[PDB]
Amino acid sequence: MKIAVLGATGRAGSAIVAEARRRGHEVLAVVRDPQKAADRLGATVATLVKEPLVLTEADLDSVDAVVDALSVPWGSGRGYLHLDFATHLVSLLRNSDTLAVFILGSASLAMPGADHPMILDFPESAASQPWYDGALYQYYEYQFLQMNANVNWIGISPSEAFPSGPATSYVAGKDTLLVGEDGQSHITTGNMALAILDQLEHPTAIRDRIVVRDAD
């Protein structure tokens, strides 16, 4: 199948591009940095150099799936982009069969033993932390997705830690932070890539959100 990867030059994105190619899919890497694309993805990966917010329906009409691996640096003040990229992507998928996987945040997950997103219980002081702006808008991105019953979107949240690393295996859940045998909560970029491509090839979480951690 043909897969457009938004944020293809990123940590999650580049891992997704590699896993996609391993699995025999045609990749279109949407990028702003051709050099980064040449170095991280390889000369052989097809490229569309365009601002994500300016992508059109035509840009996406040859593709069977889209993966949103875009992010926003902490302390930029531009956490709203998490939301804007997603709303824009959804707007291009109206009346289309196209699968769209969105990587979400950990803050929209429940703590173990809770029944609601942990961000709701954050202290007022949290808004002063550089990570909050992005966490808030990814929580909103998650809520926005649920407004769309007629688009083939899939949400996947990382565990608390999202380090770079090769794939091994992953364990999946629904809305609650997962903790492994080591008492920690982490997923590698490689294992997130496995989970994403797994859903693309066999969608089980359409219009739902899952969370993934590294297996033990």
Ligand X SMILES: NC(=O)C1=CN([C@@H]2O[C@H](COP(=O)(O)OP(=O)(O)OC[C@H]3O[C@@H](n4cnc5c(N)ncnc54)[C@H](OP(=O)(O)O)[C@@H]3O)[C@@H](O)[C@H]2O)C=CC1
Among 9, 98, 191, 199, binds ligand X (CB under 6 A): 9
Site for its own copies contains 94 (CB under 8 A): yes
160 contact, one of its own copies, ligand X, none, CB 5-8 Å limit per kind: ligand X
Which of ligand X, its own copies, none has residue 10 at its interface (CB below 5 to 8 Å by kind)? ligand X
Q: Quick one: 24 or 54, whose CB is closer to ligand X?
A: 54
For residues 165 and 142, give the distance between their C-alpha atoms in angstroms, rounded to a whole number. Answer: 25
Name the residue nearer to its own copies (CB basis): 90 or 177: 90
Q: Which residues contact 215 (CB under 8 A, 6 or more apart)?
A: 168, 169, 170, 171, 180, 191
With 0-12 / 13-18 / 19 or more C-beta atoms within 10 angstroms meaning exposed / middle / buried, residue 207 is middle
Residue 214 backbone phi and psi in degrees, to 5: -65, 140
Site string for ligand X, 145-184 (x = CB under 6 A): -------------x-x-x----------------------
> In angstroms, what is the minimal distance from the CB of 143 to its own copies?
7
Report the candidate in 174, 196, 192 with the shortest Cα–Cα distance to residue 108.
174
- Residue type for 49, please? V
- Given a contact cutoff of 8 angstroms between Cβ atoms, the answer to whether 117 and 157 are in contact is no
Decide if 6 contacts 30 (C-beta within 8 A): yes
Residues 44/19/162/186 CA torsion (nearest 10 deg): -160
Distance in Å, CB of 107 to ligand X, minimum: 6
Contact status: 36 vs ligand X (CB under 6 A): yes
71 contributes a contact to ligand X by CB under 6 A: yes
H or E element at residue 194: helix 189-201
Number of residues forming the site for its own copies (CB under 8 A)? 19
Residue keyed to tokens 């691996």: 69
Q: What is the number of residues in the chain?
A: 216
Question: What is the contact surface with its own copies in residues (CB under 8 A)?
Answer: 53-54, 56, 78, 80, 83-84, 87-88, 90-91, 94, 137, 140, 143-144, 147-148, 150
Question: What is the contact surface with ligand X in residues (CB under 6 A)?
Answer: 7, 9-13, 32-33, 36, 52, 69-72, 81, 103, 105-107, 134, 138, 158, 160, 162
Annotated binding site: 9-12, 32, 36, 70-71, 82, 103, 106, 138, 159-160
